Amino acid sequence: AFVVTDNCIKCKYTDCVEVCPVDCFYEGPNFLVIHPDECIDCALCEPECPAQAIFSEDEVPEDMQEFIQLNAELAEVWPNITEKKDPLPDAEDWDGVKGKLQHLER
Ligand code: SF4
Numbered sequence: 001a002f003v004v005t006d007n008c009i010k011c012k013y014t015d016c017v018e019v020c021p022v023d024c025f026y027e028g029p030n031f032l033v034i035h036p037d038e039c040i041d042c043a044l045c046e047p048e049c050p051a052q053a054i055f056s057e058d059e060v061p062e063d064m065q066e067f068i069q070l071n072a073e074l075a076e077v078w079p080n081i082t083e084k085k086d087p088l089p090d091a092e093d094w095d096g097v098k099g100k101l102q103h104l105e106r
């Protein structure tokens with residue numbers, strides 16, 4: 001599985017969804033997750049994300065390991081997203097700010 005990590009939050013560019021062959025992204029108000037059982041590890045999304053938030057599971061930084069289970073969890077309850085949309089209004093302001101997990105919206 002690939003995993004969406006901290007820098008997506010309050011950015012949510014949604015460039016990633018457009019390359020995904022299997023449509024395994026699920027949508028929150030200010031974040032995206034990947035469903036780990038649906039992901040085929042094609043790795044195409046990783047270079048697409050402007051926030052560089054996406055990692056191979058086996059490459060998620062130690063300080064962001066909690067994102068692995070959180071993707072799995074929220075992918076069970078959020079709606080599928082399969083089309084690019086406009087990034088969130090102040091995405092530029094939040095790209096690169098750390099510890100945005102505190103801002104995550106259910
Ligand atoms: S690795 Fe491939 S299958 Fe998995 S989320 Fe990214 S684009 Fe979709």
Ligand code: F3S
Pocket residue numbers: 004007008009011012013014015016017031032048049050051052053054
């Ligand atoms: S910011 Fe989030 S919505 Fe996709 S392009 Fe990056 S994982």
